[PDB]
Amino acid sequence: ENVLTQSPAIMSTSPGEKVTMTCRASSSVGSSYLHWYQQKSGASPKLWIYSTSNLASGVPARFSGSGSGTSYSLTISSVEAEDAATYYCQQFSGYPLTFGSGTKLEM
Amino acid sequence: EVQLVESGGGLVKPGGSLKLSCAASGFTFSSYAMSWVRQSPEKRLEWVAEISSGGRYIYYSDTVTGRFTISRDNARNILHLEMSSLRSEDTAMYYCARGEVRQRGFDYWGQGTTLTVS
Amino acid sequence: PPQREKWSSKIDFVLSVAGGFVGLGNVWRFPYLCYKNGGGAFLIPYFIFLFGSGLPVFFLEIIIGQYTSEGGITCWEKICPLFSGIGYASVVIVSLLNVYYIVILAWATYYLFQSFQKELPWAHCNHSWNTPHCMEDTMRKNTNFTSPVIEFWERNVLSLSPGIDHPGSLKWDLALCLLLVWLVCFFCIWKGVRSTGKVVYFTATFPFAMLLVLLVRGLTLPGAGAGIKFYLYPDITRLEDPQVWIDAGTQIFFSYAICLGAMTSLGSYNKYHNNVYRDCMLLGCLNSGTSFVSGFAIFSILGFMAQEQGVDIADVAESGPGLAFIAYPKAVTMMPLPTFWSILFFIMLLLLGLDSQFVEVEGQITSLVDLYPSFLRKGYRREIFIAFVCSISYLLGLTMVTEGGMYVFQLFDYYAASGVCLLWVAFFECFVIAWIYGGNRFSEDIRDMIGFPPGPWMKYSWAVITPVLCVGCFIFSLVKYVPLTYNKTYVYPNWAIGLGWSLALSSMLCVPLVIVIRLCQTEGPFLVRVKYLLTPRE
Ligand SMILES: [Cl-]
Ligand code: NA
Ligand code: NA
């Protein structure tokens, strides 16, 4: 089982900064098989980023991802209110499918 | 347009059996592959099982490969999950996800239903 | 036995496929089929067939090869046993292609051997083999005057007989080279296929560099523009006949090598979950781009020849397989120190030819040993078997380096592995996969392997477009039939045409025959008998 580890346990940010979230794998995964998800507190997740940089249908476009091989990251150009949620990185290259530990943005 | 809604779930004795279901609408249910994903009370996500368009190919997570069964009802656009022996670790909220294309992730999720064991 | 090999890397697969595609089928065959049919009229059917059927069927070949780890024959046992005859057809086709495909490299080797001289033989006809009608191109413009570039070919290389009925003697000088090429082939195959590191860096780039040099030397000529205008302008009158359709249709099946056991065999070495789609599309782009580019090299030289001698462009050269050996040497003559470039050009042809040869010889051996992996297991068995096939291939190819050889080579090129057989095979492959095995089931399988379903283009190209095109050409050819002719002036006897149709039928008939063999061999009533065979077995 290819375990994914996400670096920041939790984040609190004022609405005036940019941040980066790190997702690190136990084994390398192709660029086409890592996705990021959003979960608003108290609601079911929704797809946020796919193929390591492609942006979902409604994501604010301040979001962008980059990475390759063993390490990947999600970056926010400018944080703002209503962006608070828990974000997960997911591997999809081979079974069993695995979700990262996830990290929460608050404040 | 697209809609997913799960049904079933409640309190059961440990070692009991329970059957969940996931109704679908707004899309050609015979085409899209389907998966179940559960979230623990610790908020951690865990993958459970996947079933292909025609049900010919099926995959299981390592920790449930002996107890859970995944199946389809294409003629009525309903998805089913059957559990045989619910240990203490099985309590969670179970989500129904339309992950067709592996290069594009789980684009639609259901609302989910809770399962707990005495 | 359980053992089955796999690629060491994806680059190994890409290199093997690129070697299998690009060869004499692009730089030699395409120009003469275009020239025979009057230039631009040939392109419309060409692209219609390309995007309607060609690429989807190539992808189908590769993905069937990858889905079931087996060669040309032994995968249909796992798709649809009843229609297994398609693999036997697909192996007969390779067996016949390997017979005649080596002769072109024999001629190329003879030119290379003649090349190392103080002066090129085909530059000026002071030599003994020429007729008194000979005049240098510089003087032919000032009633039967002919050119030395054509006379060298016809009078020395071919030593051409007045007819097929008159075989004459066997040209020992060409026979020794025909044997040498088989020695080269054997001492590459007898170990196994491998990329071998740095050799690829040179092998895979030199021929394209030389082709680019030839293109630039071609377009620079005084008369190129007229050649291009002849090349790119469709004469719509030609489309009223079936030949311009079927030659263009079958040229693509030939070039992509899809109705052959090779591509499936190459696909079989991939890992199950490997994604091949983009590589297939980009390699198709490479193949068709190289083929299309070579035309500007050929027809510019032909326009130059027509401008220099003062004849119509359609009259200036042979309407047959000699076109490349007439055209490119004429361009090589137009450069400083011609001996250098004469050496390099035929080295380039040999490098383009060897790779394709090795790939498909290995494909044939791979497709046949999977029938008897125990009896023909590794060891002395392969050493004996490979030579047992190659020696018979040599003694069959030897039949057409006689003084009458060209009239037999033309018959092979027209009927054997280069015509209606390909339409037959492709029609039945698409029919099986789409309508019997189920497009939905196969799409689900493709989803499981690749992660994404094939989509509308592939689905409808398999289900509707390809069958209809193959039926249309097959019917149109026979309602408006015309007999074969060589160099647009020679008419074949009835016995030659009968031999050609026999050669084609030997390939076609494998499909219906195996159906009867399987069906009569199963017990119970017929409705159960066919049900047993329509189901995947192994
Ligand atoms: Cl071509
Ligand atoms: Na080649
Ligand atoms: Na080709």
- For helices C338-369 and C10-21, the axis angle rounded to 10 degrees is 110
Q: Does A45 touch chain B (CB under 8 A)?
A: yes
Nearby residues of C297 by Cβ (< 8 Å), 6 or more positions away:
C211, C214, C215, C218, C328, C331
Verify whether the Cβ–Cβ distance C448 to B103 is below 8 Å. no
**C457: Cα within 13 Å, side-chain hemisphere:** 12
Gyration radius (Cα) of chain C, Å? 24
Report the length, in residues, of chain B: 118
- For helices C380-397 and C338-369, the axis angle rounded to 10 degrees is 130
Task: Report CA-CA distances (Å) from C327 to C122, C169, C226, C436.
Answer: 12, 28, 16, 48
Task: Give the 3-state secondary structure of residue A63.
Answer: strand
Domain that holds residue C41: 10-533
Instruction: Specify whether the CB–CB gap between C414 and C500 falls below 8 A.
Output: yes
Which burial class, exposed, middle or buried, applies to C527 when counting CB atoms under 10 A from its CB (0-12, 13-18, 19+)? Answer: exposed
Spell out which residues of chain C touch residue B55, defining contact as CB-CB under 8 Å: none
- C283-317 burial code (b ≥16 CB/10 A, e <16): bbeebbebbeebbbbbbbbbbbbbbbbeeebeebb
Verify whether the Cβ–Cβ distance B54 to C452 is below 8 Å. no
Name the DSSP letter for residue C117.
S
How far is B64 from B55, CA to CA, in rounded Å? 18
Instruction: Specify whether the CB–CB gap between C345 and C332 falls below 8 A.
Output: yes
How far is B56 from B77, CA to CA, in rounded Å? 17
Token couple for A32:
């086409």
Q: Which residues pair with A20 in a beta bridge?
A: A75
- Sign (positive/negative) of CA torsion C340, C344, C345, C347? positive
How far is C335 from C344, CA to CA, in rounded Å? 13
Question: How many other C-beta atoms lie within 10 A of the C-beta of residue C528?
Answer: 11
Q: What angle do CA C422, C326, C125 make, to 5 degrees?
A: 155
Token couple for C461:
């190209």
Q: How many helices (H) and strands (E) does chain A have?
A: 0, 11
Verify whether the Cβ–Cβ distance B104 to A102 is below 8 Å. no
Q: Which residue from A1, A33, A96 is facing B102, i.e. has the nearest CB?
A: A33
Nearest residue to C179 via CA among C111, C105, C116:
C105
Q: Which residues pair with A42 in a beta bridge?
A: none
Which burial class, exposed, middle or buried, applies to C423 when counting CB atoms under 10 A from its CB (0-12, 13-18, 19+)? Answer: buried
How far is C264 from C255, CA to CA, in rounded Å? 15
Question: How many other C-beta atoms lie within 10 A of the C-beta of residue C74?
Answer: 19
Nearby residues of C381 by Cβ (< 8 Å), 6 or more positions away:
C375
Token couple for A72:
């990947």
> For C370-379, where are the alpha helices, taking DSSP H only?
none
Ligand 1 centroid distance, CA of C39 (Å): 14
Using the structure block, give the residue that is written with the tokens 């462009």: C313
Question: How many other C-beta atoms lie within 10 A of the C-beta of residue C335?
Answer: 13
Using the structure block, give the residue that is written with the tokens 């089931």: C441
Instruction: Specify whether the CB–CB gap between C242 and C477 falls below 8 A.
Output: yes
Q: Reduce the secondary structure of C156-205 to three states and give it as a string.
A: HHCCCCCCCCCCCCECHHHHHHHHHHHHHHHHHHCCCCCCCCCHHHHHCC
Q: Rounded to a whole number, what is the distance in Å from the CA of A19 to chain B's nearest CA?
A: 23
Using the structure block, give the residue that is written with the tokens 């003087």: C139
Share in percent of chain A as helix, strand, coil (round to 5): 5, 50, 50
> For C68-143, where are the alpha helices, taking DSSP H only?
76-79, 85-115, 137-140
- Sign (positive/negative) of CA torsion C121, C125, C130, C134? positive
Q: Does residue C1 form part of some domain?
A: no
Chains that touch B (3 or more CB pairs under 8 A): A, C
Name the DSSP letter for residue B79.
E
How far is C446 from C438, CA to CA, in rounded Å? 12
**DSSP letter string over C482-526?**
---EETTTEE--HHHHHHHHHHHHHHHTHHHHHHHHHHHTS-S-H
Ligand 1 centroid distance, CA of C216 (Å): 20
Nearest residue to C27 via CA among C253, C342, C274, C348:
C348
Verify whether the Cβ–Cβ distance A96 to B62 is below 8 Å. yes
Verify whether the Cβ–Cβ distance A47 to B61 is below 8 Å. no
**C98: Cα within 13 Å, side-chain hemisphere:** 30
Nearest residue to C17 via CA among C282, C271, C293:
C282
Verify whether the Cβ–Cβ distance A44 to B103 is below 8 Å. no
How far is C47 from C40, CA to CA, in rounded Å? 12
**DSSP letter string over C206-246?**
HHHHHHHHHHHHHHTSTTHHHHHHHHH---GGGGGSSHHHH
CATH code: domain B3-117 is 2.60.40.10
**C476: Cα within 13 Å, side-chain hemisphere:** 17
Q: Rounded to a whole number, what is the distance in Å from the CA of C444 to chain B's nearest CA?
A: 7
Which burial class, exposed, middle or buried, applies to C247 when counting CB atoms under 10 A from its CB (0-12, 13-18, 19+)? Answer: buried
Q: How far is CA C174 from the centre of its chain?
A: 22
Using the structure block, give the residue that is written with the tokens 């979902």: A56
How far is C271 from A84, CA to CA, in rounded Å? 42
Omega into A8 within 30° of 0, i.e. cis?
no
| All domains of chain A in start order, with CATH | 4-106 (2.60.40.10)
Using the structure block, give the residue that is written with the tokens 């069959």: C396
Nearest residue to C145 via CA among C162, C129, C131, C124:
C131
Nearest residue to C280 via CA among C94, C13, C68:
C13
Q: Which residue from B45, B104, B109 is facing A88, i.e. has the nearest CB?
A: B45
Q: What angle do CA C254, C257, C184 make, to 5 degrees?
A: 105
Nearby residues of C437 by Cβ (< 8 Å), 6 or more positions away:
C79, C80
Task: Report CA-CA distances (Å) from C432 to A45, C76, C263, C499.
Answer: 43, 10, 18, 30
Q: Does residue C3 form part of some domain?
A: no
Ligand 3 centroid distance, CA of B110 (Å): 50
How far is C122 from C315, CA to CA, in rounded Å? 20
Report the length, in residues, of chain A: 107
Q: Which residue from B61, B102, B112 is facing A44, i.e. has the nearest CB?
A: B112
Instruction: Specify whether the CB–CB gap between B21 and B32 falls below 8 A.
Output: no
Element (H, E) at C449: helix C439-450
Nearby residues of C107 by Cβ (< 8 Å), 6 or more positions away:
C157, C174, C325
Q: Name the E strands within A26-99.
A: 34-39, 46-50, 54-55, 63-68, 71-76, 85-91, 98-99
Q: Does residue C2 form part of some domain?
A: no
Phi, psi of B36 (to 5 degrees): -115, 140
Question: How many other C-beta atoms lie within 10 A of the C-beta of residue C109?
Answer: 21
Amino acid identity of residue C508, one-letter, is M
Nearest residue to C64 via CA among C51, C78, C53:
C78
Name the DSSP letter for residue C81.
G
- C154-176 burial code (b ≥16 CB/10 A, e <16): bbbbbbbbeebeebeeebeebbe
Phi, psi of C486 (to 5 degrees): -100, 135
Task: Report CA-CA distances (Å) from C382 to A54, C362, C373, C394.
Answer: 51, 12, 10, 18
**DSSP letter string over B13-78?**
-TT--EEEEEEEESS-TTTS-EEEEEE-TT--EEEEEEE-TTSS-EEE-TTTTTTEEEEEEGGGTE
Token couple for C393:
């291939």
Phi, psi of A9 (to 5 degrees): -65, -45
Q: Which residue from C441, C452, C453 is facing B54, i.e. has the nearest CB?
A: C441
Number of domains in chain C: 1
Amino acid identity of residue C282, one-letter, is L
Q: Which residue from B43, B103, B111 is facing A33, i.e. has the nearest CB?
A: B103
How far is C492 from C105, CA to CA, in rounded Å? 26
Domain regions of chain B by residue span: 3-117
Using the structure block, give the residue that is written with the tokens 């040993």: C369
Which burial class, exposed, middle or buried, applies to C323 when counting CB atoms under 10 A from its CB (0-12, 13-18, 19+)? Answer: buried
Dihedral Cα A45, A47, A48, A50, nearest 10 deg: 150
Token couple for C491:
């008419």
- Sign (positive/negative) of CA torsion A33, A38, A39, A45? negative
Q: Does A95 touch chain B (CB under 8 A)?
A: yes
Greatest alpha-carbon pair distance for chain C in Å reads 82
Nearest residue to C59 via CA among C362, C262, C276:
C276
How far is C223 from B77, CA to CA, in rounded Å? 69
CATH of the domain at C197: 1.20.1740.10
Spell out which residues of chain B touch residue A95, defining contact as CB-CB under 8 Å: 59
Task: Give the 3-state secondary structure of residue C108.
Answer: helix
**C351: Cα within 13 Å, side-chain hemisphere:** 20
Chain A residue with CA closest to B107: the answer is A47
Q: What angle do CA C161, C163, C168 make, to 5 degrees?
A: 45
Q: Does residue C38 form part of some domain?
A: yes
Spell out which residues of chain B touch residue C451, defining contact as CB-CB under 8 Å: 101-103
